[PDB]
């Protein structure tokens, strides 16, 4: 991710009143995965919507929650 | 994009779907008969929800603002 993704994703974060994170991929383009204490968000990799979470890959047979496998590879 | 979405709705055993615009790219909004998901156009991925446009003063909660108005 970079550093201007994260500026705008981080800015807003700011503007919005939540704190710390950790930016990740996201399987979608134009979006990042954000660890929050508010739980895992996707953000727009121009800050302007966030999409609470979770994410489910759905292209196979049973939905595989992409978030919660990414929170045990992060935590 | 929505025979993509339609297949994916099919097999997960949602029946009743409405599909709308997202102000995300490359996404839509799903109204099932149960509430709201987001869903690629591809019909790979889905969210949970609820968005946030958070572009102005403070969060504001756009699927509320699509459910309100049915």
């Known amino acids: 991710v970079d550093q201007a993704d994260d500026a705008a994703i981080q800015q807003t974060l700011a503007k919005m009143g939540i704190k710390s994170s950790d930016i990740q991929p996201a399987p979608?383009?134009?979006?990042?995965?954000?660890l929050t204490n508010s739980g895992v968000l996707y953000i727009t990799d121009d800050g302007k919507h966030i999409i609470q979470g979770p994410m489910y890959d759905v292209?196979?047979?049973?939905?595989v929650?992409?978030?919660?496998?990414?929170?045990?590879?992060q935590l």
């Open 59 to 63: 292209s196979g047979t049973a939905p």
């Open 28 to 34: 979608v383009a134009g979006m990042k995965t954000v």
């Open 65 to 73: 929650n992409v978030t919660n496998k990414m929170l045990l590879k």
